[PDB]
Design a protein around this ligand. Structure first.
Ligand SMILES: [Ca+2]
Ligand SMILES: [Cu+2]
Length: 639
């Protein structure tokens, strides 16, 4: 099932009202504690008024509300399930503001939850915008509201969490659809379970930041259950999703047509491998013993032009293996891969040993030294994160993780790796004094200003369990070499969580769980709004506008000229992201050197090396003197 983040508020003295209710199915039957009695809107002789339908609770006194739950009818009747919905809170019962949560619940009779940041409130309203299968009615057997143990206002200047997006699946994998700006998400053959899959099916869901609409879709055309896969956006602008529950399959997601297309089978069956887009737009992958067998799985490379996978048996996985106690099943998982110059791929971890991978001929691998600092040699950091926040200077920030995949203490370890040419050993140093909070299974994104946002995880890695959670996110600021705690959230985001940068500059953070009949499935996501979007008074700041671009598609080395509605101080290109199991090999950031043409007209060059400016879709952000970013303009980079 799932679970709330607080404890149920006693309903003895509640007063409730509904937009309509059938005799015998009164509004208060939803709060009588009897699973066999239910509220039901008008039907039969009363006519069949269509949704939206509304349930409003007066709890009589202020509670620190952090969620609600809906128990559907228990008599096998399926016609009142709530689909699209919104949750509002109020202190007077008349002014409701914006929803604290909204989205879509899956069509079944399981208990449904909305979990969200604690907010003091006396009144609670649930709006059923649609019935789950489009019928006229709404029904509820039991509704509950949950409270936190306490409430603390967010600190000024440290960002803001909310709202919650309620989903019909657990989003354990996700990507931005660059042409549409939507968030694409998927689970497995079921909405919350991968176990005992017959393969050939993936449940997907998308969220549109511009409309708030959650959609869903069942993908069978690629004959691929895409749980536990490699993910890369290739040079042809298609997301290459590899292996996992169907360990040899390749699926291609095309943003332009919003459709899935069969790809060629991989040469080697894999799960939990990392893949990385290359300087020439191809995709390299290596490792992955979660599925398809446990043995040495060396590299292979996908060509979008010839639609083939080709084995690179001499791109040896052996040098990048961690010393995981469980052995090869884990030790070749989730490599920290970055496409780099001349078809090379850098492997930054999680193993202590870093390596250069090469893709010419039958492949090759060369030692790049140990991840280390004056504090010592860095231990294996399975499910730590790695983020290329300045591709032009070859800067990679790595942090967190634990020596073993599970039942292992996470660390605060963090490093800056500075890449030069392939085949050279990069300089590595410790990053500041490391993380505030040791964490593994955390996720991260590079932000427009070059800072890295770090969120979720737990201190001791225990998949499917929400123990030792870390609720306080951190931001690394390179020019100060300092980490900063941000405002905390209240939903655990550990194993099977994801984070992505949205085109509007906010962070989308979600998932966790995906373990069938477990209590730790999170059918939701939350928005984090960074401090750079707020003015000194905590109101949303005015953002600069890009009013023109000379072109929206550019070859590496090419220039773009833009016009803005105000003066801008900085700009950056950020490659669109993909995420699962802590891995995001697609995001990276290029700080742009601007030429000022005067009159708020500016130009810049895209770097000429496609190992730096990896082909694909990028976000162009400009920032004013106050540090406020524009929303992204989408740029296609070609090689
Ligand atoms: Ca009842
Ligand atoms: Cu997993």
């Amino acid at each position: 099932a799932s679970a709330p983040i607080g404890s149920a508020i006693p309903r003895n003295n509640w007063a409730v009202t509904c937009d309509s209710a059938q005799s015998g199915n009164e509004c208060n039957k939803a709060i009588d504690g009897n699973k066999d009695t239910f509220w039901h809107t008008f039907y039969g002789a009363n006519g069949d008024p269509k949704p939206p339908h509304t349930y409003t609770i007066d709890m009589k006194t202020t509670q620190n509300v952090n969620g609600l739950s809906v128990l559907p009818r228990q008599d096998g009747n399926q016609n009142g399930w709530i689909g699209r919905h919104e949750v509002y809170l109020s202190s007077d019962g008349t002014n409701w503001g914006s929803p604290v949560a909204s989205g879509s619940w899956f069509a079944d009779s399981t208990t449904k939850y909305s979990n969200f940041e604690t907010r003091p409130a006396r009144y609670v309203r649930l709006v059923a915008i649609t019935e789950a299968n489009g019928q006229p009615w709404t029904s509820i057997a039991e509704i509950n509201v949950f409270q936190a143990s306490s409430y603390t206002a967010p600190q000024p200047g440290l960002g803001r969490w909310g709202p919650t997006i309620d989903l019909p699946i657990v989003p354990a994998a996700a990507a931005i659809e660059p042409t549409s700006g939507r968030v694409l998400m998927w689970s497995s053959y079921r909405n919350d379970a991968f176990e005992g899959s017959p393969g050939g099916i993936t449940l997907t869901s998308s969220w549109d930041p511009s409309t708030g609409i959650v959609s869903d879709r069942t993908v069978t055309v690629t004959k691929h259950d895409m749980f536990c896969p490699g993910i890369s956006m290739d040079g042809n602008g298609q997301i290459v999703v590899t292996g996992g529950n169907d360990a040899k399959k390749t699926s291609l997601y095309d943003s332009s047509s919003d459709s899935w297309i069969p790809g060629p089978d991989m040469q080697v069956a894999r799960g939990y491998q990392s893949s990385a887009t290359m300087s020439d737009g191809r995709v390299f992958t290596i490792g992955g013993s979660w599925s398809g067998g446990v043995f040495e799985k060396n590299g292979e490379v996908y060509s979008p032009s010839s639609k083939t996978w080709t084995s690179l048996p001499n791109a040896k996985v052996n040098p990048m293996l961690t010393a995981d106690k469980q052995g090869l099943y884990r030790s070749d998982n989730h490599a920290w891969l970055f496409g780099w110059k001349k078809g090379s791929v850098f492997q930054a971890g999680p193993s202590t040993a870093m390596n250069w991978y090469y893709t010419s001929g039958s492949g090759d691998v060369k030692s790049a030294g140990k991840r280390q600092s004056n504090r010592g040699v860095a231990p294996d950091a399975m499910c730590g994160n790695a983020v290329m926040y300045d591709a032009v200077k070859g800067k990679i920030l790595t942090f967190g993780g634990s020596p073993d995949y599970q039942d292992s203490d996470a660390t605060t370890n963090a490093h800056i790796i500075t890449l030069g040419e392939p085949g050279t050993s990069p300089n590595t140093v410790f990053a500041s004094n490391g993380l505030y909070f040791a964490r593994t299974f955390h996720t991260s994104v590079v932000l427009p200003d070059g800072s890295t946002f770090i969120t979720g995880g737990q201190r001791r890695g225990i998949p499917f369990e929400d123990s030792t959670p870390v609720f306080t996110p951190e931001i690394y600021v390179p020019e100060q070499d300092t980490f900063y705690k941000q405002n905390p959230n209240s939903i655990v985001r550990a194993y099977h969580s994801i984070s992505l940068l949205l085109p509007d500059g906010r962070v989308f953070n979600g998932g966790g769980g995906l373990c069938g009949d477990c209590t730790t499935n999170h059918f939701d996501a939350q928005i984090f709004t960074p401090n750079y979007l707020y003015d000194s008074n905590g109101n949303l700041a005015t953002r600069p506008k890009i009013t023109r671009t000379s072109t929206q598609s550019v070859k590496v080395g090419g220039r773009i000229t833009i016009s803005t509605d105000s003066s801008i101080s900085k700009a950056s290109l950020i490659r669109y992201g993909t995420a699962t199991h802590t891995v995001n090999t697609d995001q990276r950031r290029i700080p742009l050197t601007l030429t000022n043409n005067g009159g708020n007209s500016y130009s810049f060059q895209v770097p000429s090396d496609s190992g730096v400016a990896l082909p694909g879709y990028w976000m162009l952000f400009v920032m004013n003197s106050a540090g406020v970013p524009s929303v992204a303009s989408t740029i296609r980079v070609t090689q």
